[PDB]
Amino acid sequence: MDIILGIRVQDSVILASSKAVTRGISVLKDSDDKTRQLSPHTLMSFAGEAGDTVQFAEYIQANIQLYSIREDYELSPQAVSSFVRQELAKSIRSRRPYQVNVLIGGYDKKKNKPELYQIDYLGTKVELPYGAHGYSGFYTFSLLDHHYRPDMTTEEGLDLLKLCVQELEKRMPMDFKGVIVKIVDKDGIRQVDDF
Amino acid sequence: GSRRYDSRTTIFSPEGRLYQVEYALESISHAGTAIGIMASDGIVLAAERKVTSTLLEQDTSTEKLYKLNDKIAVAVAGLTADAEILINTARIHAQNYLKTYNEDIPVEILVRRLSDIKQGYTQHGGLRPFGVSFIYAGYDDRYGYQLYTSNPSGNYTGWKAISVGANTSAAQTLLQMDYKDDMKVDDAIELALKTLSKTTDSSALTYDRLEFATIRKGANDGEVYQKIFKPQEIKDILVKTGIT
Amino acid sequence: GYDRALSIFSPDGHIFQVEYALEAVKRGTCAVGVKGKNCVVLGCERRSTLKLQDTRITPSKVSKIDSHVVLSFSGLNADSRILIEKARVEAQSHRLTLEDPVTVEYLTRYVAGVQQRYTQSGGVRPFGVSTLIAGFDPRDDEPKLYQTEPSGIYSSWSAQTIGRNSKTVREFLEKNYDRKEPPATVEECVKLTVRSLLEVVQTGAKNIEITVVKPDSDIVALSSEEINQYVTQIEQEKQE
Amino acid sequence: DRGVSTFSPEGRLFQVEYSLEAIKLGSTAIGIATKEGVVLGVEKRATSPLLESDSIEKIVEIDRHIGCAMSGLTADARSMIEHARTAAVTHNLYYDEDINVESLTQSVCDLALRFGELMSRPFGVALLIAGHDADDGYQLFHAEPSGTFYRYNAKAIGSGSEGAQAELLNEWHSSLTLKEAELLVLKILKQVMEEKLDENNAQLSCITKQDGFKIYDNEKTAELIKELKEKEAAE
Amino acid sequence: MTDRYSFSLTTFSPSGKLGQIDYALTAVKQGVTSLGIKATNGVVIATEKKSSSPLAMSETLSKVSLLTPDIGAVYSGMGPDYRVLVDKSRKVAHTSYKRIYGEYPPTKLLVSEVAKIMQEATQSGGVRPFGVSLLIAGHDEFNGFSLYQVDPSGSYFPWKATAIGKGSVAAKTFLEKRWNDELELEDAIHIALLTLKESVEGEFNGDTIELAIIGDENPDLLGYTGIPTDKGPRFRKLTSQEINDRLEAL
Amino acid sequence: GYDRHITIFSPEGRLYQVEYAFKATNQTNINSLAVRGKDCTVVISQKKVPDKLLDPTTVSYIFCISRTIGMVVNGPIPDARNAALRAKAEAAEFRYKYGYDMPCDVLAKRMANLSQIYTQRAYMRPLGVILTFVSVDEELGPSIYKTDPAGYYVGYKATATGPKQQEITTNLENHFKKSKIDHINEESWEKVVEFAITHMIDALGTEFSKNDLEVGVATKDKFFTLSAENIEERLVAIAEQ
Amino acid sequence: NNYDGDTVTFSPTGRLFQVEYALEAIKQGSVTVGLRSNTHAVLVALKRNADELSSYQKKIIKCDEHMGLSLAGLAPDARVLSNYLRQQCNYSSLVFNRKLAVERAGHLLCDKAQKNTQSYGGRPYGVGLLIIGYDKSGAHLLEFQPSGNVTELYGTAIGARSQGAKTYLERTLDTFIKIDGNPDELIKAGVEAISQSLRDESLTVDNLSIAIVGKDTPFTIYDGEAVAKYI
Amino acid sequence: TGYDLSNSVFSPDGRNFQVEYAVKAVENGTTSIGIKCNDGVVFAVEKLITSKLLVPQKNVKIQVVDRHIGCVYSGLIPDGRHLVNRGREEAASFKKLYKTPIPIPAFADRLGQYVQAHTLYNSVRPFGVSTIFGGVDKNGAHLYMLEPSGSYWGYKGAATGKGRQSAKAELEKLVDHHPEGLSAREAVKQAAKIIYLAHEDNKEKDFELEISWCSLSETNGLHKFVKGDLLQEAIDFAQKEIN
Amino acid sequence: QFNPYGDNGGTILGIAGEDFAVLAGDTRNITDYSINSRYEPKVFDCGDNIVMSANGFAADGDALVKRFKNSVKWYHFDHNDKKLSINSAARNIQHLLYGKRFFPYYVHTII
């Protein structure tokens, strides 16, 4: 229903997230940004149960920002992903679990490498060249298996992503009202306005 | 009631000092001297054992130098029993950080939390403070080699070379004299032993009254090694520098 | 739980534990805050009985609470970490619920409230710390400087100092700071802060720290050489 | 030492009596009640000239119909004000009305004796609580750390209180206008203050039925100070 | 009726001494002499059974106690304090080790847990320190034989041989002359009996002396057979008769 | 000198509150004695009823803890009854938890451990009592185990407690030197009670009527106290020899 | 002396000094009188001001429709104890549909005061109370002291110079006890009783406080112009 | 010294001075007595008439526990009430679990253990009362007296308060002159006499007599107050003996 | 399984005039097809010229009226015998009802 995709290329991580918020038989909003900046070089997209998604995202954001101020230092994408995994892994055996799936795209400044982590609501973490949550993966994974190369540029990554959105717009049942695309690289996080 | 028997461990004097903290520091000044020296390619930890008996088992003994994780060690000056309470807390804290972030804990973060625990015993709870001063020697990929000290007040500071316990005033003057920034580990080993040899309250410094440890990048390809010296290795390093 | 009332009234109406906490502040290294027309500068003394220090890793005297607010202090160093931590957590909690960073007045009011609570709670002693809290409110260019103390009172200052020999540096600032015309630039403001510390500091190579806060989260700490240029310039004008 | 809740041989609580000495060291606060309103005034008393006096907040709003002035250890008053505001708003939530001034004061005074071996010591601050309600009209209360409160036609608290109270005994009558009361607070503050009274080191406020609780501007108080000086010279 | 002693009863004095720990050590000094000697193939711990009355049955009062099948303990100082420490030490060997790892703790770690318990009596609210020093002898697969002393502060030290209590100063000097690194277990038992005769005044026989060893595994003491990997306790308490046999060739 | 008011160490390594609790033990001015036969364990204690208005049947320092265990106390009655109620509860709980009757020596250890806690923990005072537990244990046979305010305990061949304890102790020591054995070599408990009273008479140097004594007897599977007439029957037998 | 640091300590003669010091706070309080007939019970109280600008401290508190008290001593302690009485009267009504007997009201106050005299940390209540009521056994008057001691009486007085009114009522006993079915006369007797405790001051309109409960009268308080009748 | 400043502290004698100080508070109180009889117990107490203004018969001091036990005490009256409130809770929980009403010896140890507990800690004060109590159970009549230390015994007769020695002497005569036993109705009359005789030690203020009784035959094993004709008869018997 | 609710029937009616108001209710009380009482009133004078009825499950209705009557009593104690206005009573009753939001009083209340 909620589409969140991620592609790691040579020098950057690209996250695409659907703009629709639907409740019942009404599309309430068509410009929703399903993402939070955790740190200058780390971005988290999210999808799942209503309310839970934003509450979890903002809670993680607050904790990473608190860490940043305390140590005057940015946590690595690997470190942030492990923190997020553990919070979800705690949550799954709570009285009421967070039903939220996330992708974490980051640029590690110490390694000079982009990194993409896929984490589900159970706390199942994997590092991937490309990732998706929900029904989107049933189309995009096979498509990317074919067209993806590890040495692609950011522009090549965006064209590869256009191919995924086109496929989802052709074969998905629901109108998801397009995507907001964001790039994470050595210079930080920026939004592509014309997609 | 019980008010009668309360020492009030967490109050100020009229001068604005914490009685119990000051008296704990007085306790620590009688404990065996421990020295830390930070070189460009490693760190030395050297400590003097506090009175020996010929019948003390020297090889299977640990009094001064404790391992916190693979990258961080501590030298102790004060009550050993108090130090072991704090060491186990620090060992757990390091593993919590590793479990959470999948990265070894930065040295300062571990030091700050141990120092925050000590601070708590001086502000609330009506208990006596921990009669312990630590020298922390460790490595992380942010700041590289680091030396810190903490004391019963819960105040901590970073050093190039430092001593705790007995005769710190004399020891610090001697370190301040012969220390320079481009120093190597093997030179620092020699400085640490020479300083203890001059400040010791014993007649002569021998292998059986010392604990010694280095933190080098001596293992190949950027991998950090902790070497807690065996008795025979201290005997050899004492001969090699010409103290015995 | 340890319940003892440690902070209590005496026959003359004083709370001695709060007053003895002020003596701990008086023992601490000097800290000064001066606000200009478009900035606030925080200056701090560092005692020079400690050579062989590692200044890379030693705790800095001025702490960032958020990207737009800073906190310096005088008194017990270990006590100050507890106040800084609580302030940093409240800063993030405010952003989370109000969707706006703290004002400097609000952050100060919180820190002062924590200090007050430790003067009428059982089992605890007061904080042996006074703070200078400086910064700029979100989307605002008016400089803010506040002071707190162990009792829990707080107030706003055009310029203020705390710590050992603070009465000497307050004397200096009282005649050298004009309310009509605050230091028009960063340069003028930093220089007045360095001058005021130079009355007490004994020299000022590694003994003086300066941190400049400008609007919209623009905070930078000066290096030794940068501060040493102010020290060199002030002494040459003095010989007159 | 000795218990925090101990009685003296004369039948008074040591800690309560000692907190009253702390309040005598505090800065002066005066309140006067009329049929046209209640006026509250305080001495700011800045410890140094560099301190920005407008940040000294010793007169405080509780609700639209209730205001409050303080004297003593003013840091202690924050949680009392916080409680008063919550009590006032909570009562409006539960009963869809304004809370009586007396009922507010009683709620604040319930905190006072909640100390012992609850908080560790009594409050070291006295409060003047002024307000209006439909039943009893314009009211002024003096709330102490003993847990007692008295209604007053006029009252002074702080370092200049016994001298100011004797002056209020002569000057108060049941036909005072609001303007007459404003000048009277300024007059009596100028008498008991150490430094010379002006708009920067003193602050006025009032509560009226029509406009509610208002702290006066420095510009408005300055004109009342000028009006007062002219009237004393005029006979 | 509630416990109002939530504050420390052991505090630092202006000189840096912890009074109650020093005074606890004074109580240990008054206590009866006990010792421990480490051999190449075993460890011996010994003490005098000071009888309170001749009508008392000193067999019912055990000064030397089994903690695990391979670890034993003896003390000097206050007997009641020792008894509760043995109860707590036996339990902690199970709760914080055997119930987790399925095997008994090594000597150094059990010692470490006892030390912790004694340290907490030095800092917690409303308690005095324990008025005892312990000598703990034991064996484990990876460390071999070992002997430890634990003091009222919670400090512990490993020893080749030592003594604590009444005549410890003389007994330590005696052990320095006789101890070498080639001592067999029987030689260490002989030296233990010689050292103890100096500090004992009255009767010196198997009924007034309490002595135990940590040595070879005792399959006969196991209580069952069939599992080759189950071995039997290395801890054994010497009988009254076994002591008197060695006192003839003394 | 607050080190004499609570249970913390004095400069010479002593606990004065524990020592002063030992002095409270003799506050009643009563002497007790315990001996073992082949089949039984007998305990005797003096009974002093000074007030004429007292109901003499309610004045007792011997307690039936369980069916098999009896306990005599030397010390004030409030602390005695405090100890007795706890021992009864502990012995009952042991049986429920572990499926067999609490042994005399295990109950002694347990009560001694409780006493040790009061010497270490500040808020609790020691009980000013010495507890002598007696039974015929199904494993160990006739048993006497004794607890004090220090938390010390040990088994006894025989024992005595009270102001004139040393006289009774040496009297018993001298008998066991002579007899060369650990117990009273006697078949019936009646004659072991007669031995106990006889040797108490010799050590204390006083004669006893039926109301001056109190007797408890432990046999296999029961502990019981004797009535005034049971003691009178026993006093007559001694007098006619 | 050495035995007055807290309520948990007995003196060598068996006295509780903290309780005696609490008793002393009552003696400093303003005078209040209680008296009754067979049909009605009346409280009269002299109120005290801080100065001429202040109000007069209210002495009388209503507990139920059939019960209430007057206070002398620490007024906040009277508020705590009256609030407890209000709850106990209320519990009796809600659970048992039963008006709380004035005797049980006394027993409950005794036991609440007692607990504060046997535990460390607490302090005794610093106030004395005169409780009046009309229940199923007619009119009642009680005297509460913070030692715990509660006493049923025909008449009494507590506070400064209470001995004057207490002597008067002791003389007037045979007269006022038979003022049945006449409220105004029973009040007149109480107002004359409190007048025997006055020195230099007389009973004015904002000084006097009267309360009455009885057979066909709920507990009601009179202040201001409603007491001008009795001066 | 300082051994007497804190409860539960042993002095060098082995005494708890705070308990001994509580005994002084008991000795200061009014006289109360207990007489054991053939098939029951009788309780009586002296009530000092401080003023004409005290309502006669309306400040009742003897208290009932359960339906079969009576309690009277001398010393701090509030402390006595606290002890009875506990006694009522103890008797209620016994009846709840075991069905049968609490036996008197069982009840005696419940109070005893509770009072003894207030000598174990410095955070509580000992009880400032000696309590005389008793009743009728399955094994017949029992009378007890309990002291601040927690000490209690069974009694043929008991007395405490300012006139305890006078009352004790008078009680000892009854025990000697009636070895077979005293009847319930006789013991009521004797109780009146003894209170009137013990009043000689408190004779400034005149007093009011209050009596109660439990008897297997006379009150059917339940606690009742003596009132009206039986009370006035007992008062007249006492008045005749003082003159 | 135990059902904590029941239906006691009956009906109530409130009308307001210019200077008056009426609150009427029938006096019948029922369960299923049986009559419990022909005269069991469920309209009550609560003091301060407020009349109240809580119709539905009678146990919950009686409990609510009982709590509101008690609320009026304590309003007098805490606020110097002030008259509880009808608008203030209404708001107070909302809080009584919503306080049991997750185990409700099964009543239609009218004042």
Side-chain angles (χ1 to χ4, degrees), chain H residues 85-107:
Chain H
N85 285 145
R86 178 72 184 199
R88 289 163 174 176
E89 289 168 25
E90 296 279 15
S93 95
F94 190 95
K95 172 122 68 80
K96 190 182 189 293
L97 181 55
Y98 304 125
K99 193 70 167 70
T100 181
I102 190 158
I104 316 305
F107 176 73

mmCIF file of all heavy atoms in Angstrom, chain H residues 85-107:
data_model
loop_
_atom_site.group_PDB
_atom_site.id
_atom_site.type_symbol
_atom_site.label_atom_id
_atom_site.label_comp_id
_atom_site.label_asym_id
_atom_site.label_seq_id
_atom_site.Cartn_x
_atom_site.Cartn_y
_atom_site.Cartn_z
ATOM 1 N N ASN H 85 -7.842 -1.684 69.309
ATOM 2 C CA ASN H 85 -8.104 -1.707 67.860
ATOM 3 C C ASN H 85 -7.346 -2.827 67.148
ATOM 4 O O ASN H 85 -7.895 -3.495 66.266
ATOM 5 C CB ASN H 85 -7.741 -0.365 67.207
ATOM 6 C CG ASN H 85 -8.746 0.733 67.504
ATOM 7 O OD1 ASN H 85 -8.372 1.897 67.639
ATOM 8 N ND2 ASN H 85 -10.021 0.377 67.598
ATOM 9 N N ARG H 86 -6.085 -3.011 67.530
ATOM 10 C CA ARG H 86 -5.277 -4.124 67.038
ATOM 11 C C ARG H 86 -5.851 -5.460 67.511
ATOM 12 O O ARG H 86 -5.997 -6.388 66.717
ATOM 13 C CB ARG H 86 -3.828 -3.977 67.508
ATOM 14 C CG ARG H 86 -2.908 -5.114 67.097
ATOM 15 C CD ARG H 86 -2.605 -5.087 65.614
ATOM 16 N NE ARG H 86 -1.791 -6.237 65.234
ATOM 17 C CZ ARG H 86 -1.059 -6.327 64.127
ATOM 18 N NH1 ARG H 86 -1.008 -5.328 63.243
ATOM 19 N NH2 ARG H 86 -0.359 -7.437 63.902
ATOM 20 N N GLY H 87 -6.159 -5.548 68.805
ATOM 21 C CA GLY H 87 -6.788 -6.735 69.390
ATOM 22 C C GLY H 87 -8.062 -7.171 68.685
ATOM 23 O O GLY H 87 -8.302 -8.365 68.508
ATOM 24 N N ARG H 88 -8.868 -6.193 68.281
ATOM 25 C CA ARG H 88 -10.087 -6.442 67.506
ATOM 26 C C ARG H 88 -9.789 -6.992 66.105
ATOM 27 O O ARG H 88 -10.492 -7.887 65.627
ATOM 28 C CB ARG H 88 -10.929 -5.167 67.425
ATOM 29 C CG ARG H 88 -11.570 -4.816 68.755
ATOM 30 C CD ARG H 88 -12.060 -3.381 68.819
ATOM 31 N NE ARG H 88 -12.796 -3.133 70.061
ATOM 32 C CZ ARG H 88 -13.282 -1.954 70.447
ATOM 33 N NH1 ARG H 88 -13.123 -0.866 69.695
ATOM 34 N NH2 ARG H 88 -13.937 -1.863 71.600
ATOM 35 N N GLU H 89 -8.752 -6.456 65.460
ATOM 36 C CA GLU H 89 -8.277 -6.975 64.171
ATOM 37 C C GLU H 89 -7.745 -8.407 64.305
ATOM 38 O O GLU H 89 -8.050 -9.261 63.469
ATOM 39 C CB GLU H 89 -7.194 -6.070 63.569
ATOM 40 C CG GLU H 89 -7.701 -4.732 63.048
ATOM 41 C CD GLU H 89 -6.579 -3.753 62.724
ATOM 42 O OE1 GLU H 89 -5.442 -4.193 62.435
ATOM 43 O OE2 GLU H 89 -6.835 -2.530 62.755
ATOM 44 N N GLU H 90 -6.960 -8.661 65.354
ATOM 45 C CA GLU H 90 -6.397 -9.999 65.612
ATOM 46 C C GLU H 90 -7.494 -11.035 65.889
ATOM 47 O O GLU H 90 -7.440 -12.160 65.384
ATOM 48 C CB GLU H 90 -5.416 -9.974 66.796
ATOM 49 C CG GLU H 90 -4.156 -9.132 66.593
ATOM 50 C CD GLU H 90 -3.057 -9.817 65.791
ATOM 51 O OE1 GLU H 90 -3.323 -10.840 65.120
ATOM 52 O OE2 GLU H 90 -1.913 -9.308 65.830
ATOM 53 N N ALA H 91 -8.480 -10.648 66.695
ATOM 54 C CA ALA H 91 -9.624 -11.510 67.014
ATOM 55 C C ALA H 91 -10.531 -11.771 65.806
ATOM 56 O O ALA H 91 -11.114 -12.851 65.690
ATOM 57 C CB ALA H 91 -10.436 -10.910 68.154
ATOM 58 N N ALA H 92 -10.657 -10.778 64.927
ATOM 59 C CA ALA H 92 -11.456 -10.905 63.705
ATOM 60 C C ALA H 92 -10.827 -11.868 62.695
ATOM 61 O O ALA H 92 -11.537 -12.674 62.089
ATOM 62 C CB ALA H 92 -11.677 -9.540 63.068
ATOM 63 N N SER H 93 -9.507 -11.787 62.521
ATOM 64 C CA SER H 93 -8.797 -12.670 61.576
ATOM 65 C C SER H 93 -8.707 -14.110 62.084
ATOM 66 O O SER H 93 -8.671 -15.040 61.283
ATOM 67 C CB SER H 93 -7.390 -12.146 61.250
ATOM 68 O OG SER H 93 -6.408 -12.741 62.082
ATOM 69 N N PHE H 94 -8.642 -14.280 63.406
ATOM 70 C CA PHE H 94 -8.670 -15.609 64.033
ATOM 71 C C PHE H 94 -10.012 -16.294 63.797
ATOM 72 O O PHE H 94 -10.052 -17.457 63.400
ATOM 73 C CB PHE H 94 -8.407 -15.514 65.546
ATOM 74 C CG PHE H 94 -8.192 -16.852 66.212
ATOM 75 C CD1 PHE H 94 -6.909 -17.343 66.413
ATOM 76 C CD2 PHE H 94 -9.270 -17.629 66.631
ATOM 77 C CE1 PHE H 94 -6.702 -18.575 67.016
ATOM 78 C CE2 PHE H 94 -9.067 -18.864 67.232
ATOM 79 C CZ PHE H 94 -7.782 -19.338 67.427
ATOM 80 N N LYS H 95 -11.097 -15.573 64.078
ATOM 81 C CA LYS H 95 -12.466 -16.054 63.827
ATOM 82 C C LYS H 95 -12.726 -16.309 62.326
ATOM 83 O O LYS H 95 -13.396 -17.279 61.971
ATOM 84 C CB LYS H 95 -13.491 -15.074 64.439
ATOM 85 C CG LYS H 95 -14.965 -15.311 64.103
ATOM 86 C CD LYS H 95 -15.852 -15.519 65.329
ATOM 87 C CE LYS H 95 -16.022 -14.271 66.188
ATOM 88 N NZ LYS H 95 -17.032 -13.311 65.656
ATOM 89 N N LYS H 96 -12.179 -15.460 61.461
ATOM 90 C CA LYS H 96 -12.327 -15.616 60.007
ATOM 91 C C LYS H 96 -11.757 -16.949 59.521
ATOM 92 O O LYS H 96 -12.433 -17.698 58.813
ATOM 93 C CB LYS H 96 -11.630 -14.462 59.276
ATOM 94 C CG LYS H 96 -11.907 -14.369 57.784
ATOM 95 C CD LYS H 96 -11.121 -13.219 57.171
ATOM 96 C CE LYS H 96 -11.520 -12.946 55.732
ATOM 97 N NZ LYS H 96 -11.146 -14.042 54.795
ATOM 98 N N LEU H 97 -10.516 -17.232 59.911
ATOM 99 C CA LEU H 97 -9.805 -18.424 59.446
ATOM 100 C C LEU H 97 -10.261 -19.689 60.174
ATOM 101 O O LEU H 97 -10.531 -20.711 59.536
ATOM 102 C CB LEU H 97 -8.287 -18.229 59.588
ATOM 103 C CG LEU H 97 -7.347 -19.357 59.132
ATOM 104 C CD1 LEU H 97 -7.582 -19.776 57.683
ATOM 105 C CD2 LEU H 97 -5.897 -18.936 59.320
ATOM 106 N N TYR H 98 -10.363 -19.610 61.500
ATOM 107 C CA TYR H 98 -10.590 -20.788 62.354
ATOM 108 C C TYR H 98 -12.029 -20.986 62.866
ATOM 109 O O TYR H 98 -12.299 -21.978 63.546
ATOM 110 C CB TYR H 98 -9.618 -20.746 63.544
ATOM 111 C CG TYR H 98 -8.155 -20.659 63.144
ATOM 112 C CD1 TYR H 98 -7.336 -19.629 63.619
ATOM 113 C CD2 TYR H 98 -7.583 -21.613 62.302
ATOM 114 C CE1 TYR H 98 -5.993 -19.548 63.259
ATOM 115 C CE2 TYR H 98 -6.245 -21.541 61.934
ATOM 116 C CZ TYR H 98 -5.453 -20.507 62.417
ATOM 117 O OH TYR H 98 -4.130 -20.437 62.051
ATOM 118 N N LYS H 99 -12.933 -20.052 62.551
ATOM 119 C CA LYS H 99 -14.379 -20.134 62.883
ATOM 120 C C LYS H 99 -14.714 -19.879 64.352
ATOM 121 O O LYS H 99 -15.521 -19.003 64.659
ATOM 122 C CB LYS H 99 -15.003 -21.461 62.421
ATOM 123 C CG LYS H 99 -16.527 -21.501 62.445
ATOM 124 C CD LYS H 99 -17.146 -20.614 61.372
ATOM 125 C CE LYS H 99 -18.631 -20.901 61.189
ATOM 126 N NZ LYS H 99 -19.446 -20.442 62.350
ATOM 127 N N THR H 100 -14.137 -20.675 65.246
ATOM 128 C CA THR H 100 -14.271 -20.461 66.698
ATOM 129 C C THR H 100 -13.773 -19.063 67.138
ATOM 130 O O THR H 100 -12.813 -18.552 66.558
ATOM 131 C CB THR H 100 -13.553 -21.578 67.513
ATOM 132 O OG1 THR H 100 -13.734 -21.354 68.917
ATOM 133 C CG2 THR H 100 -12.052 -21.659 67.206
ATOM 134 N N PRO H 101 -14.434 -18.434 68.140
ATOM 135 C CA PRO H 101 -13.907 -17.179 68.707
ATOM 136 C C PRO H 101 -12.552 -17.366 69.381
ATOM 137 O O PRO H 101 -12.297 -18.432 69.946
ATOM 138 C CB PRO H 101 -14.956 -16.791 69.756
ATOM 139 C CG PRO H 101 -16.197 -17.479 69.330
ATOM 140 C CD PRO H 101 -15.749 -18.770 68.717
ATOM 141 N N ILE H 102 -11.707 -16.336 69.330
ATOM 142 C CA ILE H 102 -10.324 -16.448 69.816
ATOM 143 C C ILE H 102 -10.258 -16.829 71.305
ATOM 144 O O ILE H 102 -10.891 -16.174 72.134
ATOM 145 C CB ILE H 102 -9.477 -15.177 69.511
ATOM 146 C CG1 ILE H 102 -7.994 -15.432 69.816
ATOM 147 C CG2 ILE H 102 -9.978 -13.940 70.260
ATOM 148 C CD1 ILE H 102 -7.049 -14.507 69.084
ATOM 149 N N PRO H 103 -9.532 -17.920 71.640
ATOM 150 C CA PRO H 103 -9.278 -18.225 73.054
ATOM 151 C C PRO H 103 -8.481 -17.125 73.753
ATOM 152 O O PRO H 103 -7.733 -16.398 73.104
ATOM 153 C CB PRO H 103 -8.459 -19.521 72.994
ATOM 154 C CG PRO H 103 -8.868 -20.160 71.719
ATOM 155 C CD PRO H 103 -9.077 -19.020 70.767
ATOM 156 N N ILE H 104 -8.630 -17.024 75.068
ATOM 157 C CA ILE H 104 -8.043 -15.903 75.814
ATOM 158 C C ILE H 104 -6.504 -15.965 75.825
ATOM 159 O O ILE H 104 -5.863 -14.943 75.579
ATOM 160 C CB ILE H 104 -8.598 -15.763 77.257
ATOM 161 C CG1 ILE H 104 -10.131 -15.929 77.318
ATOM 162 C CG2 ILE H 104 -8.208 -14.409 77.846
ATOM 163 C CD1 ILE H 104 -10.923 -15.004 76.413
ATOM 164 N N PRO H 105 -5.907 -17.152 76.088
ATOM 165 C CA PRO H 105 -4.440 -17.269 75.986
ATOM 166 C C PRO H 105 -3.888 -16.934 74.598
ATOM 167 O O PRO H 105 -2.851 -16.283 74.493
ATOM 168 C CB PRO H 105 -4.176 -18.745 76.317
ATOM 169 C CG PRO H 105 -5.352 -19.173 77.119
ATOM 170 C CD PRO H 105 -6.512 -18.423 76.535
ATOM 171 N N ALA H 106 -4.580 -17.388 73.555
ATOM 172 C CA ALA H 106 -4.246 -17.038 72.172
ATOM 173 C C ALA H 106 -4.292 -15.530 71.967
ATOM 174 O O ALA H 106 -3.350 -14.950 71.430
ATOM 175 C CB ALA H 106 -5.203 -17.718 71.207
ATOM 176 N N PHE H 107 -5.386 -14.912 72.412
ATOM 177 C CA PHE H 107 -5.556 -13.457 72.339
ATOM 178 C C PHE H 107 -4.483 -12.710 73.132
ATOM 179 O O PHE H 107 -3.994 -11.669 72.687
ATOM 180 C CB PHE H 107 -6.946 -13.040 72.837
ATOM 181 C CG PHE H 107 -7.152 -11.549 72.878
ATOM 182 C CD1 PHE H 107 -7.319 -10.830 71.705
ATOM 183 C CD2 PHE H 107 -7.153 -10.862 74.088
ATOM 184 C CE1 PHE H 107 -7.495 -9.457 71.733
ATOM 185 C CE2 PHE H 107 -7.333 -9.488 74.121
ATOM 186 C CZ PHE H 107 -7.505 -8.783 72.940
#
